[PDB]
Symmetry: C2
Subunit: 213 residues, 2 copies
Amino acid sequence: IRVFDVWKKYLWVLKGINLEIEKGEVLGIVGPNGAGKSTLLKVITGVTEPDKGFVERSGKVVGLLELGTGFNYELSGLENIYVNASLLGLSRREIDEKLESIIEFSELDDFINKPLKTYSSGMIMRLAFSIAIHTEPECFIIDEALAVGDAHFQQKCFRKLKEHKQKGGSIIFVSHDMNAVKILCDRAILLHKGEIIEEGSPETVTQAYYKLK
Amino acid sequence: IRVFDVWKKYKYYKKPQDRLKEIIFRKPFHEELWVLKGINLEIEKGEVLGIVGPNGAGKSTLLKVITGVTEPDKGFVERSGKVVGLLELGTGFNYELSGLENIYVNASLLGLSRREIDEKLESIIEFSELDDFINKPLKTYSSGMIMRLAFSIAIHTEPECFIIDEALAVGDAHFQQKCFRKLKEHKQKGGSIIFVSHDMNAVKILCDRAILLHKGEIIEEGSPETVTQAYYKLKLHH
């Protein structure tokens, strides 16, 4: 939710970053690839510790880095659901309530017992999406590379995202399509060399990015 | 390159519980299923071959035997040179290491020599378009930059065949074209490419010929029109 004066070095990747993601919000993060967007998201999700300052988050954040974490291909898809969902914080009771819905979402009911090694690359993405979309995290990190291979599958993923937004979820959108930002994002921010140059409505930020572009 | 009488099986426990019960009773309590049955195939240098089929047909397990990650239970596969696939892309990367340092381990694992790395090192870093960040460690790299780097190392190792699933290579179209241009250069240089997709239109235009894989066997093979037609005939009678 809230990022307060967070700093990260290795040179400082992030300098004086203050940010807040409110509930029910679709937030777009735009900038050069070299600006350090990945390091900013990692401090948010919590995989990277801020060198100076702090960030407080109400709940877990799910991003591409988390997606499909801990998968073991020797294990079955059904077995893999448990290990992935457990790493994402779902309780044993929660998994069983959602195991039925997760399998129906992936549409792998025929193949779910089969071990992951046999699955096609598309099937694995479909499975990891199903586990991730159901963990009910407070925030979702959506890079444009996500949602690839959607035989209308994106619509089911997109429909749950509307449900997630209505339930107080927050979404972070990482993409280079500014037009997409206006359509999906309630507000956006532009990141340059570890600092936020301009923030606000997606129209204002899209203008500023074009000024930089 | 050449796949002869390849067969591949796996254990199929009905319930996760049953994996326990087989420990207790000392008896197997699994199901043996064959991903690939009677797979005979040839890949000619300078060929774009399309592998189309249902997800269960076994394409992933078949591609994995070709790349060399999995050994066939029955039959054999012979390849003249290395094959690069999604599992290989960025294999062995350590994010704590620098982007330049990580290049060395990937190429060393992909078989490139210390001398071989250096000759093409200039173009590869210029190919990735990562200039100041090359000194920087991978952890700072964006997901795009990491994938962008991994493609760059793999695309120039000049393996005999490239396996391209359609979901793979997604990204900046301008960089995807850079990969597309190099693959055309790869084909001209005697390279062979394998195209895996559910887009028949993509298969028909790009693939010189194709095979249809269903239930672990090739039901129809040949010109892309016939195979794409055959794939439609298969979808009717299911």
